[PDB]
JSON list of C-alpha atoms in Angstrom, two decimals:
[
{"chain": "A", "resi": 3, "resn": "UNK", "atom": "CA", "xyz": [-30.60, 17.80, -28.13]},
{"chain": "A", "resi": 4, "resn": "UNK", "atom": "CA", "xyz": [-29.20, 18.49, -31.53]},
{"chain": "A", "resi": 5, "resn": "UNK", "atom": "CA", "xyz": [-30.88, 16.35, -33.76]},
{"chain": "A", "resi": 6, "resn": "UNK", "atom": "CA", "xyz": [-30.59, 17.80, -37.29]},
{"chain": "A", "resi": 7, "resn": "UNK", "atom": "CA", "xyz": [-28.82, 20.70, -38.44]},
{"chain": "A", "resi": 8, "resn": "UNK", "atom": "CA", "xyz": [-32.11, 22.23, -38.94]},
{"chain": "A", "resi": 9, "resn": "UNK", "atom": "CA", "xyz": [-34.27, 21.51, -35.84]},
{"chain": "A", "resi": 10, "resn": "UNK", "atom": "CA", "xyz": [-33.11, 21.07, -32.48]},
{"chain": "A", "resi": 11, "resn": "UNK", "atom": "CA", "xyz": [-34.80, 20.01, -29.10]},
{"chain": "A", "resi": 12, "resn": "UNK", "atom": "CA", "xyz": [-35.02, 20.74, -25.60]},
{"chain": "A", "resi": 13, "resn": "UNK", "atom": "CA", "xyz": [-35.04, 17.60, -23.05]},
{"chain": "A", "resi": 14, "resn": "UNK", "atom": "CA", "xyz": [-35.39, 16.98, -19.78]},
{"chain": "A", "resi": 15, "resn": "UNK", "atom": "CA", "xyz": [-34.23, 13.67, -18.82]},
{"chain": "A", "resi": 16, "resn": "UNK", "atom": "CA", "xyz": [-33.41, 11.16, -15.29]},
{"chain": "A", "resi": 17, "resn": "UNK", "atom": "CA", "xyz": [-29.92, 10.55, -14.45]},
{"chain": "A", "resi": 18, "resn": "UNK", "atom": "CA", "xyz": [-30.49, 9.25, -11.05]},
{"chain": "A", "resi": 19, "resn": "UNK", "atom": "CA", "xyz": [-31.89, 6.77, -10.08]},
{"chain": "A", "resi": 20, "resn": "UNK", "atom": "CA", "xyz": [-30.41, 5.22, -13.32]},
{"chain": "A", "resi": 21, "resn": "UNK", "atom": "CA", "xyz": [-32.85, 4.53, -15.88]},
{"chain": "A", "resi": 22, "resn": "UNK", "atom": "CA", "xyz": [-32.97, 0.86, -17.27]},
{"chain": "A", "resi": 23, "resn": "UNK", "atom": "CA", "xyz": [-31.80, -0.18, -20.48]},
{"chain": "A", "resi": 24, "resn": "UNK", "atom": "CA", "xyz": [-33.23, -3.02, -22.32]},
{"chain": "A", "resi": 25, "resn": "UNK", "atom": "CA", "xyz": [-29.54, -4.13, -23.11]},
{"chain": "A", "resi": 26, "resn": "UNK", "atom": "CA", "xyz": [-29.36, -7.95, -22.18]},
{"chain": "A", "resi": 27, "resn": "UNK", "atom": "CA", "xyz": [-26.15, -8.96, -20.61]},
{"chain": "A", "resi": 28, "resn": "UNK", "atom": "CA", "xyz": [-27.82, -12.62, -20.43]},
{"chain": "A", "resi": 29, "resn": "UNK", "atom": "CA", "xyz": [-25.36, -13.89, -22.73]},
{"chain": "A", "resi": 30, "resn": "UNK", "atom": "CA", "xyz": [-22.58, -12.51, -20.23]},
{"chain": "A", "resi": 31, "resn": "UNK", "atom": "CA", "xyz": [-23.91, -15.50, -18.21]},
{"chain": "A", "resi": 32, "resn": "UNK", "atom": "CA", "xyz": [-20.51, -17.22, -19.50]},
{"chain": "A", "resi": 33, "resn": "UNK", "atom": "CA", "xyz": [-18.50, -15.44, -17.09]},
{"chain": "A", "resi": 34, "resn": "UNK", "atom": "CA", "xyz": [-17.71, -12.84, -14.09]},
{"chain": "A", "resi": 35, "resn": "UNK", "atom": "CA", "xyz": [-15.05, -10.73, -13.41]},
{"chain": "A", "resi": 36, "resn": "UNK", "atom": "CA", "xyz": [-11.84, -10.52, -10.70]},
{"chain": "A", "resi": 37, "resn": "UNK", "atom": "CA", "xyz": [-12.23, -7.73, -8.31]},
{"chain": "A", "resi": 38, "resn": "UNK", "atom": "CA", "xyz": [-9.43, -6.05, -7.47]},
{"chain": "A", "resi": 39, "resn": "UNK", "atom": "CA", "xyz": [-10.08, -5.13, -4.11]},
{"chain": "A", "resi": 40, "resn": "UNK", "atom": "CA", "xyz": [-13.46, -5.60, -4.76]},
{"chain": "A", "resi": 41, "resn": "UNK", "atom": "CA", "xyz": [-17.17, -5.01, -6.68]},
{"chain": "A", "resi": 42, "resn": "UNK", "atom": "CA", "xyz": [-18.37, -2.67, -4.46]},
{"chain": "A", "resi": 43, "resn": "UNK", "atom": "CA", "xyz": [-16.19, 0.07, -4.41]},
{"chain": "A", "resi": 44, "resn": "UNK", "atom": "CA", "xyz": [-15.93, 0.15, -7.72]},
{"chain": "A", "resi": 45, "resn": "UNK", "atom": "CA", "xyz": [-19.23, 0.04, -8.70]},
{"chain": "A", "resi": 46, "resn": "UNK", "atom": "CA", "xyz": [-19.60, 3.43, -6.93]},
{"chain": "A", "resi": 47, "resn": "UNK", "atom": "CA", "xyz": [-16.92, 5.23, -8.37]},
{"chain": "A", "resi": 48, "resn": "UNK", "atom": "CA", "xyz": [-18.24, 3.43, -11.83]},
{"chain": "A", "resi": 49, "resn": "UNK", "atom": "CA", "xyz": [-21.68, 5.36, -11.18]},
{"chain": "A", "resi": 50, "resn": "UNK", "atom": "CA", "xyz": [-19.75, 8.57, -10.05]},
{"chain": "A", "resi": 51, "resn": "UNK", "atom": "CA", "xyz": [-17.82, 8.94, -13.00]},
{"chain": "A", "resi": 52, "resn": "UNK", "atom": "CA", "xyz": [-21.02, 7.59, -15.45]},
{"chain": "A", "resi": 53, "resn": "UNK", "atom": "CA", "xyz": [-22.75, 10.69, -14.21]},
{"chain": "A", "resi": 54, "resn": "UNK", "atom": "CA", "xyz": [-20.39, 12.99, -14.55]},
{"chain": "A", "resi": 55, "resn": "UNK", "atom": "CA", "xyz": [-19.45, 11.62, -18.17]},
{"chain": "A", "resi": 56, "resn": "UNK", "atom": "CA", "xyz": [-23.55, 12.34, -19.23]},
{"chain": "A", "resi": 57, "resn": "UNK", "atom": "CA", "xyz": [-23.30, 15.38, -17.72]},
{"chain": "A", "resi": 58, "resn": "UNK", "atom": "CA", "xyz": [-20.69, 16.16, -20.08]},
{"chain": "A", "resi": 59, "resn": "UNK", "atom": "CA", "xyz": [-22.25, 14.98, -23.18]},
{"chain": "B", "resi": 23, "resn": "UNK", "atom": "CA", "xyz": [3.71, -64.91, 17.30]},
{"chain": "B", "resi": 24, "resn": "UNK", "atom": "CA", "xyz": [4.22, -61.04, 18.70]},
{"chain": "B", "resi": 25, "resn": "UNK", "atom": "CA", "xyz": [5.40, -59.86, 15.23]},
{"chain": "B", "resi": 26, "resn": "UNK", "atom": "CA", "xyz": [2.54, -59.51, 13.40]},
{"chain": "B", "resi": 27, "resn": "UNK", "atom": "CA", "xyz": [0.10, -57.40, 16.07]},
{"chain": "B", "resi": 28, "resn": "UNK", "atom": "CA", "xyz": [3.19, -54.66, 15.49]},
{"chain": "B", "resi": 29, "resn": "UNK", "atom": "CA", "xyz": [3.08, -55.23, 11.73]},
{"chain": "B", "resi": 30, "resn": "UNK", "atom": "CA", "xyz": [-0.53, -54.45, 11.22]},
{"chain": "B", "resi": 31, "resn": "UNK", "atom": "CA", "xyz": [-0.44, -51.50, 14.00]},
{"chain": "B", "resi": 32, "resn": "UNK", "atom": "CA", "xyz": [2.57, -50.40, 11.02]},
{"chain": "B", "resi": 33, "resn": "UNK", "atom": "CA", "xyz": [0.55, -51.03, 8.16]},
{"chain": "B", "resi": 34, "resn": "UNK", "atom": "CA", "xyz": [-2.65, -49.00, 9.98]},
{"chain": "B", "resi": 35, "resn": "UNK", "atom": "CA", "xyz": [-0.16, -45.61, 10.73]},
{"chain": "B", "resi": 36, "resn": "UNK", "atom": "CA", "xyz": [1.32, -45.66, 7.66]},
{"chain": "B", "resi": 37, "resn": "UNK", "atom": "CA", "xyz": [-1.92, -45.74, 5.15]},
{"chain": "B", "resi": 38, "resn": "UNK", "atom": "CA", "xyz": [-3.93, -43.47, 7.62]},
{"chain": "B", "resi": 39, "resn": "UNK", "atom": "CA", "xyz": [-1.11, -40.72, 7.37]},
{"chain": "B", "resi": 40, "resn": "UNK", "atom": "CA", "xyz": [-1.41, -41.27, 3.44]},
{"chain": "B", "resi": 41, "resn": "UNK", "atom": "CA", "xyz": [-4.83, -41.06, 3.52]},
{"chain": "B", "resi": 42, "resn": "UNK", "atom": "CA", "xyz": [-4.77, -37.75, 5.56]},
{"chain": "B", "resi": 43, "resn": "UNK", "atom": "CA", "xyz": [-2.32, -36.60, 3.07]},
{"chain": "B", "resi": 44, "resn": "UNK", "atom": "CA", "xyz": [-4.12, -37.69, -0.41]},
{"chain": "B", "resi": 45, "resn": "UNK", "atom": "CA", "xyz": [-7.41, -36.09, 0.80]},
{"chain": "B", "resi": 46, "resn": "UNK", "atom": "CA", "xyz": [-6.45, -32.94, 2.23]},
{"chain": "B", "resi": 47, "resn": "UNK", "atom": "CA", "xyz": [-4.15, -32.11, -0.71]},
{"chain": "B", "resi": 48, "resn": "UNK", "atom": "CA", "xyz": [-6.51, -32.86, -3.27]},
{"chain": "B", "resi": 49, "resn": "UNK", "atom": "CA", "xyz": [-9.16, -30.96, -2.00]},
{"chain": "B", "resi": 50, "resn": "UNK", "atom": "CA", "xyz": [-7.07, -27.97, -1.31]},
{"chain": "B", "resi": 51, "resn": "UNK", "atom": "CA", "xyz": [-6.56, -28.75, -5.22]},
{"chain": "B", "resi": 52, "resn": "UNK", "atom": "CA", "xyz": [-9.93, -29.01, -6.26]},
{"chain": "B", "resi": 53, "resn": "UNK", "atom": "CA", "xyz": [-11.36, -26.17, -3.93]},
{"chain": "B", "resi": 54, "resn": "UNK", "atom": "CA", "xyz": [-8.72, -23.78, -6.24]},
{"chain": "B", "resi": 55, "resn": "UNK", "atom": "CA", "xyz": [-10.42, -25.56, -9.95]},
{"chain": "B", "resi": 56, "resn": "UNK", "atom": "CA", "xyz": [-13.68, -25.22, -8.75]},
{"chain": "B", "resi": 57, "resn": "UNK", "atom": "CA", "xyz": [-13.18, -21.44, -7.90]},
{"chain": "B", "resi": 58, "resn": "UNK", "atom": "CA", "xyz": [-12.04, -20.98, -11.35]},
{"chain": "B", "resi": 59, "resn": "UNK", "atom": "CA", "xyz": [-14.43, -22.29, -12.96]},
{"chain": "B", "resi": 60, "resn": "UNK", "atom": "CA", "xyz": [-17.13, -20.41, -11.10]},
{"chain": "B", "resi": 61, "resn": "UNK", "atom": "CA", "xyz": [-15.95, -17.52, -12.86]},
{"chain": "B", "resi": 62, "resn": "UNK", "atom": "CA", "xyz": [-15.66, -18.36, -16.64]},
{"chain": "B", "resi": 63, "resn": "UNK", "atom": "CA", "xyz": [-17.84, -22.06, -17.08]},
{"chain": "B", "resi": 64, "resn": "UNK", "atom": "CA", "xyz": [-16.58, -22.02, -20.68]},
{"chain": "B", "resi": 65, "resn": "UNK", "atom": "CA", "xyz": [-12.91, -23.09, -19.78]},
{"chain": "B", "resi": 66, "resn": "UNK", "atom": "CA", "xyz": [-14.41, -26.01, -17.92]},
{"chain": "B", "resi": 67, "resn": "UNK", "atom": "CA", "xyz": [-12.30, -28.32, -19.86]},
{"chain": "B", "resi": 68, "resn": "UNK", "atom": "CA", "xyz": [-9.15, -26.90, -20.22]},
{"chain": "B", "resi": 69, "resn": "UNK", "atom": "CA", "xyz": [-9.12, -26.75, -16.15]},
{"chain": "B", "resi": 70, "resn": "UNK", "atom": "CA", "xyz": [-10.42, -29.82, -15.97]},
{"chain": "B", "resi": 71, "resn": "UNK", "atom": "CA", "xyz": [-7.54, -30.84, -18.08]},
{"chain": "B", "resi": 72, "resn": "UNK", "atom": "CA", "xyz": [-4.70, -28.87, -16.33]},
{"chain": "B", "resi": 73, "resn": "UNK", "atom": "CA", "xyz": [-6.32, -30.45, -13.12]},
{"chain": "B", "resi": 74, "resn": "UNK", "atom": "CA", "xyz": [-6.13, -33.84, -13.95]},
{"chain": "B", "resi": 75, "resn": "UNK", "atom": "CA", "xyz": [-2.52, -33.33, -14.93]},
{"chain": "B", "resi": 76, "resn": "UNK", "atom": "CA", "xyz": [-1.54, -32.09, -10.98]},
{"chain": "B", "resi": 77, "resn": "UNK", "atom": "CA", "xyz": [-3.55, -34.40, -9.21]},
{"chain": "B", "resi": 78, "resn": "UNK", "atom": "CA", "xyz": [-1.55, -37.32, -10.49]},
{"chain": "B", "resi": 79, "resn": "UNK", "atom": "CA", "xyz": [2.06, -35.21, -8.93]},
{"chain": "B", "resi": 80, "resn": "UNK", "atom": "CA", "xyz": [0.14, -34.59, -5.65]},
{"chain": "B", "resi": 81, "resn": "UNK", "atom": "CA", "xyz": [-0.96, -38.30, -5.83]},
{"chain": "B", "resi": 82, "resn": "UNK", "atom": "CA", "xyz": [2.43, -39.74, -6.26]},
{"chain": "B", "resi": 83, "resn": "UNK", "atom": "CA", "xyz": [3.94, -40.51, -2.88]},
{"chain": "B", "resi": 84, "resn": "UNK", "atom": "CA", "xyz": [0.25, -41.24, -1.03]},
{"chain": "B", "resi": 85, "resn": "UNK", "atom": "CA", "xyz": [-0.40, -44.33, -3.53]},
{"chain": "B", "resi": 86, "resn": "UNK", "atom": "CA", "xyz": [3.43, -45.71, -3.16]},
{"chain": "B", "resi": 87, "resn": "UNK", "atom": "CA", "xyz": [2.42, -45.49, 0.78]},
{"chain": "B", "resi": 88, "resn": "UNK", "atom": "CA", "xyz": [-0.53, -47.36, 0.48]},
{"chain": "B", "resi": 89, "resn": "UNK", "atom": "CA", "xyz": [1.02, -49.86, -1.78]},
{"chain": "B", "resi": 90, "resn": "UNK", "atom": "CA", "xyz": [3.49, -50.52, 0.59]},
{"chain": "B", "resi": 91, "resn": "UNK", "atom": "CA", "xyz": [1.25, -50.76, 3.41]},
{"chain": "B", "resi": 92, "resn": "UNK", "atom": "CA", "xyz": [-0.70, -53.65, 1.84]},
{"chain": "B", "resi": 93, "resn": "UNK", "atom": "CA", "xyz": [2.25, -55.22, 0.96]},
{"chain": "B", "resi": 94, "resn": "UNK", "atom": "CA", "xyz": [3.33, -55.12, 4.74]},
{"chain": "B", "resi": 95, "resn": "UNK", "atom": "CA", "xyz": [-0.14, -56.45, 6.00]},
{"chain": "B", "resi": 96, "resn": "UNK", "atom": "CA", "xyz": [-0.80, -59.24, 3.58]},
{"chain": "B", "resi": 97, "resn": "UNK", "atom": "CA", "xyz": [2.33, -60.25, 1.41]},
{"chain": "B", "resi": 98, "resn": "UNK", "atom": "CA", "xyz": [4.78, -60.04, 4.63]},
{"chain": "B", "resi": 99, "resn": "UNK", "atom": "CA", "xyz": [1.80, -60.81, 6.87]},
{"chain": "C", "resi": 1, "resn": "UNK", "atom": "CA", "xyz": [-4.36, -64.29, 22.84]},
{"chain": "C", "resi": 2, "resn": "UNK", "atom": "CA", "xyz": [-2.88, -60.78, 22.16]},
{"chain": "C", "resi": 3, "resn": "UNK", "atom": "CA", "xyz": [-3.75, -60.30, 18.34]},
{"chain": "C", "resi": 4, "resn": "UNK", "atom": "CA", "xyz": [-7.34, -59.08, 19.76]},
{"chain": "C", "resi": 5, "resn": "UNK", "atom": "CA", "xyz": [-5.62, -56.50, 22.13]},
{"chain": "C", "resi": 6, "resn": "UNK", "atom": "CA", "xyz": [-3.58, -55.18, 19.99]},
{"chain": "C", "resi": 7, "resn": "UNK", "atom": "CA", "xyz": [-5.84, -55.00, 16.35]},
{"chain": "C", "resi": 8, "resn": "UNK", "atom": "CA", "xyz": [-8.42, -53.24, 17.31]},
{"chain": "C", "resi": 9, "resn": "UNK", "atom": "CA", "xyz": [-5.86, -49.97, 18.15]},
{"chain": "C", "resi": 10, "resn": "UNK", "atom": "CA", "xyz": [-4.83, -50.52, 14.48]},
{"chain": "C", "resi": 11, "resn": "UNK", "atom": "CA", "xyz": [-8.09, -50.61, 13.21]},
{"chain": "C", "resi": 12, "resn": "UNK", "atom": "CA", "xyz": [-8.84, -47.57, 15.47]},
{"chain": "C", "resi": 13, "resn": "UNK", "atom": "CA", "xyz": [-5.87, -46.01, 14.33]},
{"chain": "C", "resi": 14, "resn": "UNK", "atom": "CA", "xyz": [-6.37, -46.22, 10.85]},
{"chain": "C", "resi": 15, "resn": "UNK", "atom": "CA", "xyz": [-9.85, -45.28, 11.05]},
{"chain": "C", "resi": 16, "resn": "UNK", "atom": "CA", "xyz": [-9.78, -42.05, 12.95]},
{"chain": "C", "resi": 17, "resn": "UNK", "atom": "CA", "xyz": [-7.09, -40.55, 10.48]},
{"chain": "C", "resi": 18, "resn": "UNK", "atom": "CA", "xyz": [-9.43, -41.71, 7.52]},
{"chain": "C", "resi": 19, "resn": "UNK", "atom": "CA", "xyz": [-11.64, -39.53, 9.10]},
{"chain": "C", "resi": 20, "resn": "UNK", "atom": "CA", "xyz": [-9.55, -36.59, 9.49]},
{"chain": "C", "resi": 21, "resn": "UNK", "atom": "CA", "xyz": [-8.86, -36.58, 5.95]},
{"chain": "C", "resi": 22, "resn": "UNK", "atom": "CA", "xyz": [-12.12, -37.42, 4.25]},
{"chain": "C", "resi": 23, "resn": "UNK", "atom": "CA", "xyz": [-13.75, -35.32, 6.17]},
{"chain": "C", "resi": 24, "resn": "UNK", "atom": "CA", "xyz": [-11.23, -31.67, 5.74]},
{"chain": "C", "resi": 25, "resn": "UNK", "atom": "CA", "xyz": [-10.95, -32.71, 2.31]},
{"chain": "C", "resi": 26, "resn": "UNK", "atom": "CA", "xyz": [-14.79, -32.72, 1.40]},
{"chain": "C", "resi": 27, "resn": "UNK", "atom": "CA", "xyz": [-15.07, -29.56, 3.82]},
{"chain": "C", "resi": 28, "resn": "UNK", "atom": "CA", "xyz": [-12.68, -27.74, 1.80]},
{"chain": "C", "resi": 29, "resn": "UNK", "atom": "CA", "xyz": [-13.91, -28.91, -1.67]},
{"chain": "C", "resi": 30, "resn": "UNK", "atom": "CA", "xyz": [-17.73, -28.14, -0.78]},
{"chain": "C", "resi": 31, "resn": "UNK", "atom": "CA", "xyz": [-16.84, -24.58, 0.69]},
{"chain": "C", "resi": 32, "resn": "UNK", "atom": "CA", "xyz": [-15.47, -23.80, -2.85]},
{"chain": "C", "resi": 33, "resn": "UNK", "atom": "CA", "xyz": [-18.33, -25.37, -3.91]},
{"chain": "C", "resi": 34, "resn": "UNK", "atom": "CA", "xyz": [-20.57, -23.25, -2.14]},
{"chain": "C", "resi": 35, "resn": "UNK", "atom": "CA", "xyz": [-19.08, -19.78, -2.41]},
{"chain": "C", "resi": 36, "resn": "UNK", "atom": "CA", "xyz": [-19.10, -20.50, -6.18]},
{"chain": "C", "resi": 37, "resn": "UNK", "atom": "CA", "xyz": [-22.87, -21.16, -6.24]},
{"chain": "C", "resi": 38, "resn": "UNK", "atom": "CA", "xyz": [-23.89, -17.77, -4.22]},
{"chain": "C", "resi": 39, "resn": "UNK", "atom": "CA", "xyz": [-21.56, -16.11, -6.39]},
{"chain": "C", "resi": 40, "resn": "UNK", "atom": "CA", "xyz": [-23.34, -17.34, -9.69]},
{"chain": "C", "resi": 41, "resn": "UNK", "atom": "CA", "xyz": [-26.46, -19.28, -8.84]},
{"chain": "C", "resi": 42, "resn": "UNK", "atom": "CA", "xyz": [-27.93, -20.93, -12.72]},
{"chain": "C", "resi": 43, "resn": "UNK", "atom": "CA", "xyz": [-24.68, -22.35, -12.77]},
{"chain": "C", "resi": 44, "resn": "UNK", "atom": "CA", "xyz": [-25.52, -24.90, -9.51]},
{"chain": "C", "resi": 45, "resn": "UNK", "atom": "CA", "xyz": [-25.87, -27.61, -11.37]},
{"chain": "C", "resi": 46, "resn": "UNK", "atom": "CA", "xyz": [-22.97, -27.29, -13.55]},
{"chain": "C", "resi": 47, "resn": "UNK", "atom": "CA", "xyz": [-21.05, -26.88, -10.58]},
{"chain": "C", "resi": 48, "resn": "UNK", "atom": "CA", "xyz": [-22.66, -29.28, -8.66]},
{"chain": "C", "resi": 49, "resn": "UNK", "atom": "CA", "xyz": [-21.36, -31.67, -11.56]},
{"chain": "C", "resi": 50, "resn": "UNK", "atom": "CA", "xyz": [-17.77, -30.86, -10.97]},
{"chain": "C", "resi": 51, "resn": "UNK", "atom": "CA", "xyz": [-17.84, -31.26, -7.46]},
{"chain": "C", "resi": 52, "resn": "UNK", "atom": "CA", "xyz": [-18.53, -34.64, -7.94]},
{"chain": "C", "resi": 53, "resn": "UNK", "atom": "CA", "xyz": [-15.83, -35.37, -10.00]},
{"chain": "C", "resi": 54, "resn": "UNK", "atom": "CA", "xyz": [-13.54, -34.19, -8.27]},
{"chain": "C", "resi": 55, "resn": "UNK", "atom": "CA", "xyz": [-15.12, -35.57, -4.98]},
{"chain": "C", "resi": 56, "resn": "UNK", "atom": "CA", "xyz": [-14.71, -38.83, -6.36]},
{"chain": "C", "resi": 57, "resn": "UNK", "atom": "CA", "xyz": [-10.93, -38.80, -6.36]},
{"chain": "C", "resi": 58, "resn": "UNK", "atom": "CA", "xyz": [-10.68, -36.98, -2.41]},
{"chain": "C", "resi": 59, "resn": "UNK", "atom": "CA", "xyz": [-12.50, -39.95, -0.94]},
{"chain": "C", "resi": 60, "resn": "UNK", "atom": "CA", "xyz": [-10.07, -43.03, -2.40]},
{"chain": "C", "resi": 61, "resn": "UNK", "atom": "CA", "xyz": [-7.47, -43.28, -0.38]},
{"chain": "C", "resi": 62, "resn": "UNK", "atom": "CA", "xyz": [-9.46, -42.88, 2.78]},
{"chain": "C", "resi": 63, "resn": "UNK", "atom": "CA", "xyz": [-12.26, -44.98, 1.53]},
{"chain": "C", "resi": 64, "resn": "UNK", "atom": "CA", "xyz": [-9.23, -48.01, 0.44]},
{"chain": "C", "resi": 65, "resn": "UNK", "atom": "CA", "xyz": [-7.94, -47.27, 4.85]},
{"chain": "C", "resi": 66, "resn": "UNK", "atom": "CA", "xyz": [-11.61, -47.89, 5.45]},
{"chain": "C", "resi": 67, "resn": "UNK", "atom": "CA", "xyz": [-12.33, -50.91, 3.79]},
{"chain": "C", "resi": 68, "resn": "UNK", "atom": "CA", "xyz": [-9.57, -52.63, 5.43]},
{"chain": "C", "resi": 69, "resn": "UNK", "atom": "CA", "xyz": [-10.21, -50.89, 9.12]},
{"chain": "C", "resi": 70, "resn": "UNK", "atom": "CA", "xyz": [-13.20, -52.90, 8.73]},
{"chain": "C", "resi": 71, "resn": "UNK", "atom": "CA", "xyz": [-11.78, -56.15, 7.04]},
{"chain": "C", "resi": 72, "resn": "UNK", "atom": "CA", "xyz": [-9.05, -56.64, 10.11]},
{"chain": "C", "resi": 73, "resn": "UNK", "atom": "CA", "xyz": [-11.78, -55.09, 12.56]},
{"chain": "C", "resi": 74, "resn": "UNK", "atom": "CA", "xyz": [-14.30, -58.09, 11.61]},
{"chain": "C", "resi": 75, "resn": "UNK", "atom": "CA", "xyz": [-12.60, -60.63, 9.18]},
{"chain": "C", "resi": 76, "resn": "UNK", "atom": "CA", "xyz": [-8.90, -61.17, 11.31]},
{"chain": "C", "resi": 77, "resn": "UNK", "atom": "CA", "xyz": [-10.78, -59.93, 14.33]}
]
């Protein structure tokens, strides 16, 4: 983990199963979205490519 | 006299079909508002409004039937 | 004489197709209803609000063929 120019970290960290944010999406309450075809399949490739974007970083 | 038996039987088809026809159309209406407003609450009243607005055109010919029927059953008797 | 043959088909007409509509109206309405609620449950009651609102304006016309099912039914005969 590079940290400061200076001192630098190794890390081992979870990627699966995902690790929970304290983000609250309770104010999303207002709304949902349209599914085209629908939330499942997306959600996995969602994941899929969330993975493979970390991995990259 | 044998007239009138026939002109209530008239009266009774004519405002069940409108009947039939004012309900089922405005709940296919209101089946399609209340879906949208499942998904986003906060337009509420902007479908409520746009939904108010159709309901009167899908109301139109249903309430000129039933007027018609009560003037067959009581003004013509 | 025949005015109690014939009446009661009119009321029975008029009645049954009442019927039909109230009832495939409200079904319609109150699946939308439903699958909304599953879909985003906390909202029920705001839901639950607009389904009677727009319940209110399925059930006229078929409540109006009622009322007078019932008048000719009992009242004429």
């Amino acid at each position: 983990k590079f940290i400061n120019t200076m001192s630098q970290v190794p890390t081992i960290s979870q990627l699966l199963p995902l690790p929970a944010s304290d983000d609250d999406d309770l104010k999303h309450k207002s709304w949902d979205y349209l599914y085209e075809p629908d939330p499942k399949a997306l959600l996995d490739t969602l994941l899929r490519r969330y993975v493979e974007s970390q991995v990259y970083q | 006299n044998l007239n009138m038996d026939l002109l209530y039987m008239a009266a009774a088809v004519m405002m069940g079909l409108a009947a039939i026809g004012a309900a089922i159309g405005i709940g296919i209406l209101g089946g399609k508002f209340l879906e949208g407003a499942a998904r986003q609450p906060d337009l509420i009243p902007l479908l409520r409004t746009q939904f108010f607005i159709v309901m009167g055109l899908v109301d139109a010919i249903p309430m000129i039937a039933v007027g018609l029927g009560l003037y067959v059953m009581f003004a013509v008797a």
